Amino acid sequence: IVWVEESVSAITLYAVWLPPAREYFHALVYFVCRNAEGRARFAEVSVTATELRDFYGSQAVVAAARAATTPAASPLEPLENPTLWRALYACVLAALERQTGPVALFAPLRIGSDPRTGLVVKVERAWGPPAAPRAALLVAEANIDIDPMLAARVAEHPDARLAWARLAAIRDTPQCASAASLTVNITTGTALFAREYQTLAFPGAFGDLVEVCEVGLRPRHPQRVTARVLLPRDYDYFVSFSAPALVALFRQWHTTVHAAPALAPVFAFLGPEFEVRGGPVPYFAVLGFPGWPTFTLVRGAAAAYAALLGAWPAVGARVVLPPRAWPGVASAAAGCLLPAVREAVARWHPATKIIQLLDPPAAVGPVWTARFCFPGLRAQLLAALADLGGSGLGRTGLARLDALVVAAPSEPWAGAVLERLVPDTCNCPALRQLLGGVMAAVCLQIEETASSVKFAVCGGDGGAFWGVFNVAASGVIEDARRAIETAVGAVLRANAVRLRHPLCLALEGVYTHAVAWSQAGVWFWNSRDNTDHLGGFPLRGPAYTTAAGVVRDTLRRVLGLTALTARGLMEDACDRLILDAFNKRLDAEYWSVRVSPFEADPLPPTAFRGGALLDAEHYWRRVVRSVGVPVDLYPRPLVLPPVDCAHHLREILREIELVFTGVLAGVWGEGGKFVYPFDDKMSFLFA
Amino acid sequence: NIGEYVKHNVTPRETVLDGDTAKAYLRARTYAPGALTPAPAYCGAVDSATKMMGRLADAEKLLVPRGRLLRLAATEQQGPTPPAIAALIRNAAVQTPLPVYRISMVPTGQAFAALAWDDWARITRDARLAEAVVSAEAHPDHGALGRRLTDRIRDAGGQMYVNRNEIFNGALAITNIILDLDIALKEPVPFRRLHEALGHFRRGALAAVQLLFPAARVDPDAYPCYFFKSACPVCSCTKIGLRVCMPVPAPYVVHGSLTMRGVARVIQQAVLLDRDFVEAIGSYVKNFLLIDTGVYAHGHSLRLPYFAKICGRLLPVFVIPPACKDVPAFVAAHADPRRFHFHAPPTREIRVLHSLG
């Protein structure tokens, strides 16, 4: 139990194996420890079937230990079962904190070890100046020869992303990684590492950038084991996407390093490329062979690494609590909730109306509109209600959530993590229900306090709401802000929902005109000093942001009339838009639309051999059109038949028509929908 | 009258472009500036239907991002790099849009020529009169001057120079009114009677052009109408085929097959109202439908002046404008391609008449 003050840079998963066991298994975890140099230790954990299932979602342990084919050349094992690997890494990161003690990245740490075994048994907090986390650049690019035929995999899975198809093809035919030209450059400055590869199998130094280390462990199993690792020197993580390039580089690294007799690590990676339908956020999780992360602004990446033990975003919602532990905590946090808000949660429907709001279309004229927001209110309520329901559930994931919540105002990266965490913490209906109910009570409190501080809500959600006044003006707006803050605080504390940091209600604008045409479509304007805001207009491409600019100019002038003249201005604005569009009639990416893997175009077979461009498509497909072209799957520049600006302009003009019909009806009462004659005039420009 | 016919039987839609927009529209929707300007030799792709299909196939192999006469007429795009037709043509300095031609061949069979530039000297110098002759001709009456200057006149790589048909492209704007007369006649018509008939055709046609194109200065005195007349001083004529080519007035440009179909219809109603015209053309001609309007659609090909049919070359007849100012200049336009091509470069704001209903 000798103790040293060291700081782990990465917790990576080295081995997973079963003893003479049926309902549990063990894992060996690799510590990249440092000090004022680096050292390489390991810990032994033990995860039972119930813990695995809790972090999985309910499956067996005999299936998370037969993913010990990952110590081989076949390099894309999580493609078979991504949720299994998410669950295994999260459950090992929970069992480690539960057995050894509180483990945290980049922090000074008192670390123990039993000399007979060599493994870390206990970990405690300590004091000291830790090493400033280092970094190393990584310019990885490779020529994976995947035969277009990627057509098959997308045939079985229609809405699949081509990065996933690329990885599935490599998994099907592994030797495409062992015959692929590759060019890599790692610049830590201590030793520059360029390399040259005709084929990746065929031929500074690899020893000048890493250290090969053999450590003799004797876990509790059948015999003594030798764990060999690559210890980073003078860097803690790569910074850069070509994910097959990284996989092939690390795969030949594994082959060369581990071709001598001693046990081989897991060699497992997770990214949005590994799911069929992709993932909105990019990342490259390294939970296996090499040892250290390869982050794909870098300050936010490093900080999110340190806060959430690097499990995020690979694990997902498992950072905070196991997925099978959410019903218990939700019901517990409902039990400690007032009966009124109990019933409010009990009747939460995503379409039920709580506050009486302005019905689309509406127009509030020359009065002091506001736009109020409780920043990250859903995250705060999730954290507070999770603390309240912790009696139903150990709390280290809650600590991670709490650190994110208390850091969000000062760190935008925490805000981004929360915005990708709360939508997936349950998506698990009980959390939708409880969050909706607590928000319903918050909305009612805003109503009741508004009726006394000279305010009237005219839209919003409860955490982001906007409304009008009954009135110098800056003073009453300040009063309304303070009164509503205190009211939501008091009503939240009544329900025992205790928030980590006191509520702040931000005044996101003091506007003097507002028009609403849909549930989210609202435009605000300030005559006293031009500062508009427009929400609800889609931005699916550059043409859409130019259209948003046009719509905002048009609305400025149309409300500057303070209805036929308004129609004249709107039609002339459309005229100018179409003319300027014809000036950009040839730019392909300008008319491109970004479409998810969930909305409905066919993939042309020629797009299925654009080489390595297919591996940068994890979430969005950016298509021009009447035949659709996936622009990013072709080299540059593009030879193209003249882009069908009629289709794209008709799309954009239908959104503009939504906006304009709403404005015309709201302001003056004209029931006539604004319709642009496109075929009658200006269609000929692209015939 | 003709005013009543253009009030009750036409619905004109025009859209105004201006500034950079007008220039961009003209550049994109007409032939390239160098296309119809004379050149030493020709660059372009010219072959039979089979060979041209094969080369289009071998040109789409190089067209990886997206993807017989509908396709030749469709290959038009330049950007900031060499145009897309540079793969079929194999010449890397072409500029688009570029002319597309259907080519009758002996003994039968159709070929195509999609080419950027061409020596139009080889085609037109056997009928391009000397400026000394024009000046030295002596003949004060314009009818007489026109009649005498008319009197004086005189593999696919070989067949495009004796037989050539411009293919109409609905994606391209139209800068000339190219009519196609089809004069049936039981009795042969003497040449001076026919020349007077064309001279009275032109003023009715110019009145029609004025009606259709209000914002303009179409003077029925000096507006250039270019008449060509198939041979057969008469052609020993016993159907006569004419060809009237007019500049579309400078501010305007026509778009759409339907639109030029309507334009031809309105000019036919203009000419079959001129009481001084139906005297000359009358008493010889069986029919009276003097213009074929079903020639303007996307894909139909019309023979070009200085070319024969597989053989009456459309050599010009100089129906000289009355009160014309520069006779040598007028004579010097029958040989320029830009006065008798649908989609030529026109010779501020513009107005596109894209609909007549």
Side-chain angles (χ1 to χ4, degrees), chain A residues 1-148 150-687, chain B:
Chain A
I1 56 170
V2 63
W3 293 275
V4 65
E5 192 206 295
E6 279 182 347
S7 298
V8 63
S9 294
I11 300 299
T12 188
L13 203 161
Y14 182 107
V16 166
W17 84 97
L18 73 165
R22 179 192 59 118
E23 294 294 328
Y24 73 108
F25 70 82
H26 288 224
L28 190 151
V29 175
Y30 176 35
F31 266 77
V32 172
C33 298
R34 274 191 210 281
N35 195 289
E37 61 89 20
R39 292 180 181 177
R41 310 145 196 293
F42 316 95
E44 191 199 346
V45 285
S46 65
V47 181
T48 62
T50 300
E51 312 175 10
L52 178 63
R53 252 181 309 259
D54 293 352
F55 280 88
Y56 182 9
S58 198
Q59 293 177 56
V61 286
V62 177
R66 274 51 150 161
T69 77
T70 79
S74 58
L76 278 297
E77 210 49 53
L79 267 193
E80 184 178 1
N81 223 316
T83 310
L84 185 155
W85 284 90
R86 294 210 220 280
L88 162 70
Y89 188 77
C91 77
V92 168
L93 284 194
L96 180 85
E97 291 179 352
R98 178 186 62 69
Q99 291 181 234
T100 66
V103 65
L105 295 166
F106 293 149
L109 272 192
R110 280 197 65 246
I111 284 189
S113 78
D114 188 10
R116 68 180 65 251
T117 304
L119 278 81
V120 162
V121 180
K122 192 176 186 184
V123 180
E124 319 182 4
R125 307 311 199 196
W127 64 87
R134 305 306 168 187
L137 277 297
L138 178 61
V139 187
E141 201 47 21
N143 187 5
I144 301 296
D145 203 327
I146 286 300
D147 185 74
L150 302 178
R153 293 300 197 175
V154 180
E156 289 96 10
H157 292 98
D159 59 358
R161 308 288 100 166
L162 283 72
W164 179 82
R166 190 79 180 277
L167 287 181
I170 301 184
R171 169 209 197 209
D172 193 293
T173 59
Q175 312 283 347
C176 67
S178 179
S181 308
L182 193 153
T183 301
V184 65
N185 307 294
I186 305 184
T187 313
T188 185
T190 301
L192 182 60
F193 189 69
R195 271 297 193 296
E196 186 184 2
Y197 289 115
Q198 180 181 1
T199 62
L200 183 63
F202 293 166
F206 190 77
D208 290 306
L209 187 148
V210 309
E211 176 190 301
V212 177
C213 179
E214 292 181 353
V215 180
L217 316 175
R218 329 174 181 242
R220 68 205 59 232
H221 286 171
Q223 264 280 355
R224 194 203 65 73
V225 66
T226 311
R228 166 187 329 175
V229 292
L230 287 178
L231 192 71
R233 60 210 315 170
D234 65 74
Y235 71 92
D236 294 358
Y237 51 93
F238 290 161
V239 172
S240 182
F241 190 61
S242 300
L246 273 291
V247 170
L249 179 62
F250 290 155
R251 161 192 191 288
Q252 176 76 13
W253 274 10
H254 188 292
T255 300
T256 299
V257 162
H258 278 106
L263 289 69
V266 169
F267 185 40
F269 312 90
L270 271 173
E273 293 83 3
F274 289 76
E275 298 264 327
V276 176
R277 273 158 277 276
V281 65
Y283 61 91
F284 191 72
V286 175
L287 58 90
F289 158 58
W292 62 89
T294 306
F295 297 137
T296 66
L297 189 151
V298 64
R299 292 183 291 113
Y305 191 69
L308 313 179
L309 275 182
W312 176 261
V315 289
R318 304 167 180 62
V319 184
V320 295
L321 191 66
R324 304 213 322 191
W326 273 124
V329 65
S331 177
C336 313
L337 212 63
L338 269 71
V341 183
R342 267 171 266 184
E343 186 188 1
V345 173
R347 304 173 303 183
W348 176 75
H349 178 69
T352 290
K353 177 171 295 183
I354 307 301
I355 306 175
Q356 67 273 16
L357 301 182
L358 285 186
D359 300 300
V364 298
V367 295
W368 299 97
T369 305
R371 193 164 175 282
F372 278 119
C373 179
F374 284 117
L377 183 63
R378 283 189 54 115
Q380 289 171 109
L381 294 174
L382 183 63
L385 289 158
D387 172 65
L388 195 60
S391 300
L393 61 86
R395 294 223 186 188
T396 42
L398 299 161
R400 306 176 192 121
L401 197 48
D402 295 333
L404 292 175
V405 172
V406 301
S410 302
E411 298 295 329
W413 59 260
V417 172
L418 281 175
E419 289 298 329
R420 277 254 71 76
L421 179 40
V422 176
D424 270 313
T425 187
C426 285
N427 175 316
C428 203
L431 271 296
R432 292 180 179 91
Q433 201 174 298
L434 170 64
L435 276 179
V438 178
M439 297 292 326
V442 172
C443 297
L444 292 176
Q445 203 34 230
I446 318 174
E447 210 169 293
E448 181 198 69
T449 300
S451 58
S452 179
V453 74
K454 302 169 180 58
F455 189 64
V457 179
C458 297
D461 199 287
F465 73 96
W466 70 264
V468 301
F469 278 77
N470 181 22
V471 66
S474 310
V476 70
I477 302 154
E478 183 65 25
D479 284 347
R481 203 185 58 79
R482 273 175 281 120
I484 292 173
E485 292 180 353
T486 69
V488 193
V491 158
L492 282 180
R493 261 172 288 278
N495 295 293
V497 178
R498 192 176 183 181
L499 282 47
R500 283 84 171 93
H501 62 316
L503 301 153
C504 177
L505 186 61
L507 183 64
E508 294 294 328
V510 188
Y511 292 158
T512 193
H513 270 270
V515 295
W517 58 90
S518 185
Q519 73 290 311
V522 298
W523 186 74
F524 304 71
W525 176 47
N526 194 306
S527 314
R528 276 72 182 272
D529 55 354
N530 184 48
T531 301
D532 67 357
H533 180 263
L534 187 145
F537 210 78
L539 317 184
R540 314 231 311 161
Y544 283 86
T545 188
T546 61
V550 175
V551 175
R552 273 158 62 175
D553 295 0
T554 306
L555 291 203
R556 272 154 199 131
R557 309 165 193 119
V558 169
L559 274 296
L561 302 187
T562 316
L564 297 192
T565 181
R567 295 171 161 290
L569 277 296
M570 293 180 183
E571 285 192 1
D572 192 42
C574 292
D575 279 343
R576 185 196 315 104
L577 192 145
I578 316 294
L579 298 186
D580 305 1
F582 175 91
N583 276 124
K584 293 182 283 187
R585 66 190 184 276
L586 298 179
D587 197 356
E589 61 87 20
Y590 180 87
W591 301 103
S592 74
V593 298
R594 46 192 82 102
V595 62
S596 297
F598 304 99
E599 293 83 3
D601 267 9
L603 294 174
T606 292
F608 277 109
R609 84 291 183 279
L613 302 149
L614 282 70
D615 83 351
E617 192 201 306
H618 51 73
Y619 188 50
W620 286 115
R621 215 171 267 146
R622 202 166 53 120
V623 174
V624 294
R625 183 183 289 271
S626 165
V627 168
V629 173
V631 297
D632 313 288
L633 314 183
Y634 301 115
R636 279 297 202 285
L638 303 179
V639 308
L640 272 183
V643 298
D644 174 338
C645 312
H647 180 271
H648 293 302
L649 272 173
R650 272 184 189 110
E651 300 293 325
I652 297 169
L653 291 196
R654 184 181 41 260
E655 284 93 9
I656 292 155
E657 275 162 348
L658 294 174
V659 186
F660 282 163
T661 289
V663 175
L664 280 187
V667 188
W668 294 283
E670 317 308 299
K673 300 179 295 300
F674 172 95
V675 178
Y676 197 55
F678 196 63
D679 277 308
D680 306 294
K681 68 182 178 67
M682 304 275 257
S683 187
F684 66 93
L685 294 171
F686 320 94
Chain B
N1 297 5
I2 192 66
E4 304 281 352
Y5 187 78
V6 298
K7 169 186 155 220
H8 299 69
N9 297 27
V10 65
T11 292
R13 293 191 259 121
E14 65 182 1
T15 284
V16 181
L17 314 164
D18 205 313
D20 296 0
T21 300
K23 186 170 186 179
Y25 191 77
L26 288 193
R27 180 69 182 86
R29 284 321 201 280
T30 60
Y31 293 171
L36 295 188
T37 61
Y42 80 98
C43 73
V46 64
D47 272 312
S48 177
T50 306
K51 324 180 182 179
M52 186 70 31
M53 182 179 72
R55 214 192 310 201
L56 285 172
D58 288 330
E60 291 180 353
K61 287 190 185 174
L62 283 72
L63 294 197
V64 298
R66 189 182 294 179
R68 74 281 190 191
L69 62 83
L70 277 296
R71 309 178 31 193
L72 275 183
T75 288
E76 279 82 11
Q77 181 62 255
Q78 175 160 307
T81 63
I85 196 66
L88 173 86
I89 291 173
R90 185 177 181 270
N91 290 113
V94 287
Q95 295 178 59
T96 61
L98 62 82
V100 177
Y101 297 121
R102 163 186 322 180
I103 297 171
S104 297
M105 321 275 268
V106 298
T108 181
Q110 279 196 1
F112 300 85
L115 53 85
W117 45 76
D118 186 6
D119 215 358
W120 282 85
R122 176 178 291 172
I123 296 167
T124 75
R125 68 185 177 181
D126 49 355
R128 191 267 184 276
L129 287 198
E131 303 180 58
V133 176
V134 177
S135 61
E137 191 146 19
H139 264 289
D141 291 331
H142 289 287
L145 178 54
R147 297 182 262 232
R148 310 299 161 241
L149 304 160
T150 299
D151 194 17
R152 178 64 180 86
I153 296 298
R154 68 161 177 176
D155 300 300
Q159 272 275 345
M160 92 195 78
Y161 277 144
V162 306
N163 179 281
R164 194 190 273 200
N165 301 292
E166 194 209 354
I167 311 178
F168 195 107
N169 194 87
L172 286 145
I174 309 165
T175 58
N176 287 323
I177 311 191
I178 293 181
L179 303 188
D180 188 5
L181 271 53
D182 201 42
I183 303 299
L185 61 83
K186 180 68 173 66
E187 314 300 300
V189 61
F191 177 59
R192 74 280 191 190
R193 282 271 289 182
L194 161 70
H195 193 292
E196 184 271 333
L198 311 193
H200 286 182
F201 183 109
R202 66 181 298 291
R203 74 181 181 51
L206 288 187
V209 170
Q210 177 74 237
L211 291 163
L212 303 189
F213 295 123
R217 183 70 274 172
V218 174
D219 179 18
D221 295 335
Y223 200 94
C225 298
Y226 302 99
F227 308 72
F228 310 89
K229 190 266 185 180
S230 310
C232 182
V234 297
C235 66
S236 302
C237 302
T238 187
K239 166 199 309 182
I240 298 171
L242 277 296
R243 158 75 42 84
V244 185
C245 308
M246 261 165 288
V248 171
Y252 284 80
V253 160
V254 177
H255 189 94
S257 308
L258 213 53
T259 305
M260 181 84 47
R261 197 178 317 178
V263 162
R265 174 211 311 151
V266 174
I267 297 169
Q268 183 215 5
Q269 287 296 112
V271 298
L272 292 174
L273 276 174
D274 207 331
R275 296 312 161 183
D276 291 331
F277 171 68
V278 298
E279 301 276 356
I281 193 78
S283 73
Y284 314 84
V285 170
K286 305 299 294 299
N287 291 318
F288 267 118
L289 58 88
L290 298 176
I291 294 170
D292 291 331
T293 61
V295 67
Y296 295 113
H298 186 89
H300 200 255
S301 69
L302 183 62
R303 74 192 272 160
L304 289 145
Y306 303 100
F307 298 99
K309 166 182 182 178
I310 283 303
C311 297
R313 275 182 91 201
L314 295 158
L315 308 162
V317 298
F318 302 81
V319 170
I320 175 167
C324 171
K325 181 67 174 66
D326 291 331
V327 178
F330 159 64
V331 173
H334 299 234
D336 291 331
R338 287 164 305 195
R339 280 76 170 177
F340 57 88
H341 270 99
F342 296 123
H343 316 294
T347 317
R348 318 306 180 187
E349 65 183 1
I350 66 170
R351 334 168 84 90
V352 180
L353 191 83
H354 52 284
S355 306
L356 301 164

